[PDB]
Amino acid sequence: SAIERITKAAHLIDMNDIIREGNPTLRTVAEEVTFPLSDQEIILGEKMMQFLKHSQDPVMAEKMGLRGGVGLAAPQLDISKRIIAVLVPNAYDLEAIMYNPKIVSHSVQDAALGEGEGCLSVDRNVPGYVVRHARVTVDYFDKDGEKHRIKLKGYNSIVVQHEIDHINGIMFYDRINEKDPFAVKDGLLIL
Ligand SMILES: Cc1nc(NNC(=O)[C@H](CC2CCCC2)CN(O)CO)c(F)c(N2CCN3CCOC[C@@H]3C2)n1
Numbered sequence: 001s002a003i004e005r006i007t008k009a010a011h012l013i014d015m016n017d018i019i020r021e022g023n024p025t026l027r028t029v030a031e032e033v034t035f036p037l038s039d040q041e042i043i044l045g046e047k048m049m050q051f052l053k054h055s056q057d058p059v060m061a062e063k064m065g066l067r068g069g070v071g072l073a074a075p076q077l078d079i080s081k082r083i084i085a086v087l088v089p090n091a092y093d094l095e096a097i098m099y100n101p102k103i104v105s106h107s108v109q110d111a112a113l114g115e116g117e118g119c120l121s122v123d124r125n126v127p128g129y130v131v132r133h134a135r136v137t138v139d140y141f142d143k144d145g146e147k148h149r150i151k152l153k154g155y156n157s158i159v160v161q162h163e164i165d166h167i168n169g170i171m172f173y174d175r176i177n178e179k180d181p182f183a184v185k186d187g188l189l190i191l
């Protein structure tokens, strides 16, 4: 399985482990993890965070052939589990490996990155504002099964929502306004 080979001590996630649109796993709803986690589930979270760190290192990214990433979801590795990693630099505005993340509150206000979004699973540009909640309250469990409840805004909020979308089989272009991709709707904050 993908999880068995990715969690080998010697394995370094690279772009060859990341599946692309057309793979049905990106459109399936990922399964919750149970606690306690297996060793493989903990190692996977660590491997995903290591990939983000490699992806943000100019030297390692070029040597490994990586697209830069600030987040990653296990379904992008063909692993249909509710596991995400987020690494948003300021050192880091947000560094977390989240098990069973869930939005439990959201603002009426929407937000979208002014520069649109990309996706490591999408090998093409799709222009437009990806409309998301401006602010979210997120529950998740860490590797030890301890529960965390955090409040996010700005870029941090966008990144986590993008990853949660992946574990629900949703892609970023699902949220662009097709009729006018750069419409600034009432109540939409452009970051
Ligand atoms: C905004 C941004 N999106 C990058 N790519 N897309 C991704 O991360 C996808 C996830 C993001 C897409 C929009 C919201 C979440 C991956 N995905 O598909 C996950 O599911 C970046 F790489 C990036 N940064 C800023 C920080 N920089 C530090 C130095 O190193 C380079 C790095 C570049 N910012």
Ligand code: NI
Pocket: 118, 119, 120, 121, 162, 166
């Ligand atoms: Ni993505």
